[PDB]
Amino acid sequence: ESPIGVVVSSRRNGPWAELTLVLTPQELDQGKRLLLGELVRVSSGGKDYVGMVLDGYYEPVGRSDPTYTLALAHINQVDLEKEDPWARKEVNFYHHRIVLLGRVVQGGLFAPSTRLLPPVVEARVYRMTEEELQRLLAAEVRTSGSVKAEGKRRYAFGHLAYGLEEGGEYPEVVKEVDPALFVGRRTANFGKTGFGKSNENKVILTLLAHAFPRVGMLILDQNAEYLLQTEATTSPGLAQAFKALGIRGRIRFYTAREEAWARRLKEHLGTEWREYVEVLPLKVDFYHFPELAVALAYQRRRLQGAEPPQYLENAFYNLEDWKHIPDRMAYVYGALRKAGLTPRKGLKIKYKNENYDISEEKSWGNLQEAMGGARELYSRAKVFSFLRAFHAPGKEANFLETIKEDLLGEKTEGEGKVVILDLPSLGEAADFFTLRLMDLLFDRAVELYGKRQANFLVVLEEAHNFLEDKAGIFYRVAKEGRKYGIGMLYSTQSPASIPMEILSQTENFLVKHLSSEEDVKVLKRAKAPFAFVADFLLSEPIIGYSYVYFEPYQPFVVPLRVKLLEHVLKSLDS
Amino acid sequence: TSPGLAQAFKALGIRGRIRFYTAREEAWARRLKEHLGTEWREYVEVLPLKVDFYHFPELAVALAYQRRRLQGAEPPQYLENAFYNLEDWKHIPDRMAYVYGALRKAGLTPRKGLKIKYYDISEEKSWGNLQEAMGGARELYSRAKVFSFLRAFHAPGKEANFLETIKEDLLGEKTEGEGKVVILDLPSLGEAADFFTLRLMDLLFDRAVELYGKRQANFL
Numbered sequence: 001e002s003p004i005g006v007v008v009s010s011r012r013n014g015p016w017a018e019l020t021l022v023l024t025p026q027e028l029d030q031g032k033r034l035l036l037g038e039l040v041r042v043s044s045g046g047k048d049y050v051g052m053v054l055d056g057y058y059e060p061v062g063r064s065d066p067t068y069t070l071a072l073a074h075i076n077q078v079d080l081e082k083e084d085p086w087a088r089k090e091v092n093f094y095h096h097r098i099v100l101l102g103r104v105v106q107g108g109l110f111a112p113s114t115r116l117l118p119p120v121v122e123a124r125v126y127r128m129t130e131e132e133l134q135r136l137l138a139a140e141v142r143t144s145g146s147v148k149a150e151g152k153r154r155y156a157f158g159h160l161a162y163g164l165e166e167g168g169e170y171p172e173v174v175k176e177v178d179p180a181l182f183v184g185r186r187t188a189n190f191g192k193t194g195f196g197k198s199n200e201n202k203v204i205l206t207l208l209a210h211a212f213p214r215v216g217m218l219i220l221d222q223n224a225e226y227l228l229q230t231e232a233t234t235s236p237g238l239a240q241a242f243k244a245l246g247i248r249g250r251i252r253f254y255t256a257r258e259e260a261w262a263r264r265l266k267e268h269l270g271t272e273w274r275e276y277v278e279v280l281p282l283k284v285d286f287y288h289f290p291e292l293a294v295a296l297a298y299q300r301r302r303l304q305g306a307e308p309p310q311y312l313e314n315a316f317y318n319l320e321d322w323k324h325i326p327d328r329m330a331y332v333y334g335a336l337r338k339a340g341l342t343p344r345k346g347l348k349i350k351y352k353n354e355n356y357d358i359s360e361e362k363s364w365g366n367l368q369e370a371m372g373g374a375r376e377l378y379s380r381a382k383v384f385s386f387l388r389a390f391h392a393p394g395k396e397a398n399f400l401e402t403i404k405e406d407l408l409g410e411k412t413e414g415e416g417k418v419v420i421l422d423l424p425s426l427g428e429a430a431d432f433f434t435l436r437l438m439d440l441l442f443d444r445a446v447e448l449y450g451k452r453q454a455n456f457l458v459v460l461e462e463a464h465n466f467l468e469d470k471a472g473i474f475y476r477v478a479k480e481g482r483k484y485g486i487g488m489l490y491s492t493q494s495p496a497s498i499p500m501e502i503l504s505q506t507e508n509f510l511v512k513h514l515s516s517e518e519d520v521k522v523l524k525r526a527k528a529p530f531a532f533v534a535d536f537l538l539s540e541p542i543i544g545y546s547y548v549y550f551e552p553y554q555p556f557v558v559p560l561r562v563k564l565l566e567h568v569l570k571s572l573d574s
Numbered sequence: 575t576s577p578g579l580a581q582a583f584k585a586l587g588i589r590g591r592i593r594f595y596t597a598r599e600e601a602w603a604r605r606l607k608e609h610l611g612t613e614w615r616e617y618v619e620v621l622p623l624k625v626d627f628y629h630f631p632e633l634a635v636a637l638a639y640q641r642r643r644l645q646g647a648e649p650p651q652y653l654e655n656a657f658y659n660l661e662d663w664k665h666i667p668d669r670m671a672y673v674y675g676a677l678r679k680a681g682l683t684p685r686k687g688l689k690i691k692y693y694d695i696s697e698e699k700s701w702g703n704l705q706e707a708m709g710g711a712r713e714l715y716s717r718a719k720v721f722s723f724l725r726a727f728h729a730p731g732k733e734a735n736f737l738e739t740i741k742e743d744l745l746g747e748k749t750e751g752e753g754k755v756v757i758l759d760l761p762s763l764g765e766a767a768d769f770f771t772l773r774l775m776d777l778l779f780d781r782a783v784e785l786y787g788k789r790q791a792n793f794l
Contacts (some may be wrong), residue, residue: 292650299646306648313650317717367709432646439645446764471643483761 004032004040005096007123015098018054020127025092034096035162037559039133039156041126044118048103050136051125052556053531055097056252067090085446098125107148110139112557133160133173141553154178155207155251156571157548158560164542179211181508181550182489183457184482185338187492188503190523192258192510195543197491198225200510201234201459202565204489206241209250210458210572214414216407216456219440220434222423222532223461227253227261228279236565238418239269239277240439244569248275254399254404255422256282281359282399282426282433284340286384290332296321296390297383299432312374312383322374326350330367332389337364344394390429402436407456408444414455432515439473445484453485464497478502496522511548513541529557579755580618584610586706591592592618595736596759597727623736623763624729625770628684630737631673635771636659638720654719664712667691672711680721685730685762727766732737737774744793745781748782751792 005027010019019042023032034053042049048560060066064314069091073080080088102112128136137160142148154176162168182204189197205226208215219238225294227238236244239251247515255261258279265273298312308334315332322328330349337343337358349356351370357363371378406417423430443455456479460466466474467490478488479502492498495520503526511530514520533547549557578583579622580592596602601622606614620760639657642649647733656663656673663669673694678695679686686696692708694700732738743754760767782791 308648313691314716317719320719435645443764449762449764450601471640473644477643492623 001126002128003123003124004034004353007118007120007125009120010123012117017117019051019098019118019123021098023094023096025089026277028092028094033185035165036324037162038534039128039136040098040323041120041128041132042098042100042123043100043126045116049114050101050103051098053096053103053397054099054262054532055300057095059093059095060091061093062090064090084154091353097274104136108139109133109144109146109148112141112555130170130172134517137173137175137558139555141555152178153211155211155529155568156563157203157207157544158562161545161559161561163536163545169561175266175558177207177546177550179207182487183212183455184206184453184485184487185507186478186487186505187489187501187508187510188236188498188506189489189510190495190514190519191546192495192515193540194543195512195541196546196562197493197512199544199565200546200562202226202238202241203493203563203568204239204498205459206245206565206568207500208420208574209238209242209247209416210245213247214455216417216519217419217459218403218407218456219459220417220419220423220461221228222422224422224424226459227251227420235570237275238420241267241565241569243276245572247265249278249417251277251418251420251424252280253420254280254282254403255327256425257422262424264546270568280399280402281392281395281397282398283390283395284397285344285390285393285395286336286387287333287343287347287393289398290336291319293336293384293387294573295436296387296429298434298563300386301428309383310379311373311380314373315377324523327352328372328374330347331371331378334367334371335377335381336384336387337473338378338381340388341384342393350433389427400433400440403437403442404440407441408448408454413452419454435473438477441472442477442481442484442486444487445481446514449484454481455485457487457489459489460490463492464494467502470499475499475502479505495519495526498522500526507551509547511537511547511549513537521547533557544553578609579757580606580610582615583654585753589616593621593740593754594757594759595621595623595740597762598759601658602759609746621736621739622729622734623759623770624683624734625729625736625737626730626732627677627682627728628674628688628730628733629732630773631677632660632676633766633769633773634721634724635673635726637766640765640769641720641762647794650717652710652717656714659710664707664726667708669711672708672715675708676715676718677721677724679705679715679718681725682721682724682728683730727763737770737777741781744778745785745791750789754794765766788789 005021007021007071008020008022009018022066034056034090036053036056038053040051040053042051047163048224063329069087076252078084083319085233100114102114105111117443157177158175160173160175171396187204189200191197201277205217207215221227226237229235229240253261260354262279263418265277283294294312294316298316299310304484320334322332326349333349339438343359345359346357347359349367351360351367356367358367369400394513406412406419423434426433460474466472467478469475477486481488494516495514496516500522503522508528511523514523514537518537520538524531524534527549529549546560546562547557548560576703591769594602599622603620606618606620610617613715625633633658637651639649642653655660660673662671674690674695678701684696688694690704693704695704740756743749743756758771759769763770785791
């Protein structure tokens with residue numbers, strides 16, 4: 001409860017007021033130290049400011065020659081500590097630089113920086129207490145002469161830390177977040193791979209699910225990690241978190257490996273797992289949706305020459321007109337049959353005027369021997385072979401329409417829904433289906449304008465593969481979705497890849513260790529407040545250590561140890 | 575609770591000056607009554623945002639081109655050619671007729687009295703003869719469904735055309751002075767907002783350049 005050192009100078013460096021602190025032999029021998037990036041209290045003229053330790057260096061004090069003194073002591077085999085403390089009292093000093101971030105005034109308002117520079121004899125520096133740190137992490141920028149809103153519940157997100165140093169961690173100084181920061185806004189989760197991205201995302205999603213039961217989610221699970229704990233870890237997934245929290249009938253899992261996924265769900269959730277997760281297939285019957293097959297074959301890899309076939313191009317548009325003529329539809333159905341898609345039991349065509357049963361081999365042969373644009377598709381039938389991996393006879397489901405109904409239907413208005421798409425099980429059609437579903441959902445959200453908001457969050461992984469194209473649906477959603485109530489939470493591990501237009505418009509930032517100066521430069525260019533920690537980010541690979549910044553009313557970037565999902569679940573049931 | 579511009583005009587007693595163009599007139603008129611009272615019609619006029627593509631086919635082609643490359647990539651060769659050379663096509667009636675027929679097949683109702691010189695396309699019988707009677711334009715003719723989505727914001731005539739209505743609101747010979755505050759509800763337009771705004775700005779600038787020497791545009 002005493003000043004740490006003595007203030008010997010102050011000034012205005014650029015946009016910030018700073019001061020110089022000197023730790024003397026008494027403080028140094030009593031084991032008093034300051035950590036880089038530590039927050040301290042500064043008293044000057046009856047007013048308290050928040051200060052941050054930015055620097056530390058050794059300088060002579062008075063008329064002394066520390067190099068000569070120490071070298072002579074070393075040469076003469078003299079121990080300064082036990083012997084001759086008088087020469088040790090004249091070199092044992094240290095210098096620190098402290099920046100004044102602002103002050104906390106009124107009922108928790110933050111007044112940034114300062115227009116008043118403190119005289120040296122007035123200023124004093126104090127170690128901040130736990131209660132002061134708690135009250136400081138809750139301060140926000142606000143309109144002057146107003147009253148804090150207060151109200152809605154807040155949940156612990158992490159606790160303050162200053163690296164891996166002993167004595168630099170404060171388990172009781174937690175940062176509490178209102179989950180409404182995440183609904184309708186943009187969240188960026190940066191950092192290298194394996195440093196806490198999955199845990200952070202799962203904690204955020206669990207908090208949203210617990211606090212806003214009317215907000216849905218569309219998770220594009222590229223790594224297959226948001227439903228159950230993976231074999232290479234033991235951190236629970238969303239299904240286990242919802243089972244612990246008692247939330248029933250909200251998770252719809254779309255996959256093409258339903259048997260395996262149900263096998264795992266049985267063992268991880270017990271015999272009652274049907275009340276927590278609902279498994280649905282990602283396979284369609286192409287005899288019901290020939291347009292889907294045409295679009296898939298048309299939008300394929302196109303190695304080397306990027307020339308879509310002319311016959312496929314013509315079919316893509318005119319297949320809807322062809323559906324009114326059996327003579328033209330028989331060629332499409334025969335093309336699929338010849339490509340190798342097994343039809344239903346009892347599927348019947350009418351080539352000229354007579355009934356043929358393609359389901360039966362002899363009828364198929366009869367029609368084949370019996371055989372305006374539909375003929376070219378039959379001639380080039382093998383182009384549909386790759387579709388077999390996605391074919392399922394007798395389904396008539398259209399998971400695309402099912403998901404659109406789940407997320408934006410009138411009957412399912414409110415009530416929330418967590419739609420998790422197991423993308424890796426779709427093979428090479430995953431990109432096509434993802435783009436088509438996103439454009440469908442955006443169109444429906446635009447349709448609902450003026451009547452209600454979409455009210456769901458898109459969870460996207462490896463966002464640099466989708467946000468780079470400025471003419472794409474995902475860039476369009478990231479840019480305009482706030483007008484229709486659609487949020488986005490994206491993780492990239494490489495900010496330099498994300499366009500600066502998207503970066504400048506993001507609201508929430510969670511940054512972990514980055515090993516690229518380009519990444520750090522883009523981070524500081526987008527957000528100035530991240531300039532105080534850019535040096536730590538480059539040089540300190542710490543796992544589970546994050547820098548958080550939520551806009552627009554957060555004073556400075558906060559370093560946190562993020563809470564584990566196990567602890568969050570264990571504390572949410574009390 | 576910061577007052578809007580319509581509420582500020584109500585407070586100041588300014589009447590008959592706000593023209594609000596939108597595609598959700600019902601939804602907006604339900605809020606206007608709630609906030610301005612039962613007399614809200616004295617301060618704001620709500621109008622639709624529909625256009626005619628038989629007079630602005632550049633917008634049709636550009637909107638189709640945008641609608642592609644957003645649901646995938648690689649716009650077709652004919653579409654890319656049209657996007658750039660429709661202006662040159664506008665002076666060859668043979669090529670223009672194919673675009674007009676493409677829109678008609680897509681299913682955009684024209685205005686009665688519209689004819690092409692490949693014919694009364696509006697008339698339900700001459701259309702059959704022309705279609706049976708009938709290059710980049712020829713290729714674009716067959717793929718007529720690329721314009722289907724345009725039916726979302728299509729309307730025949732010139733009184734429906736908000737591009738013309740705003741032009742006379744801000745530069746009308748009769749409406750000289752006295753001011754008019756035109757407000758566009760851009761979000762309700764969805765993906766066509768940028769193209770519509772650019773076209774409207776170009777049209778207004780051209781009209782203002784035409785009017786130089788007689789009167790000033792005089793708007794912000």
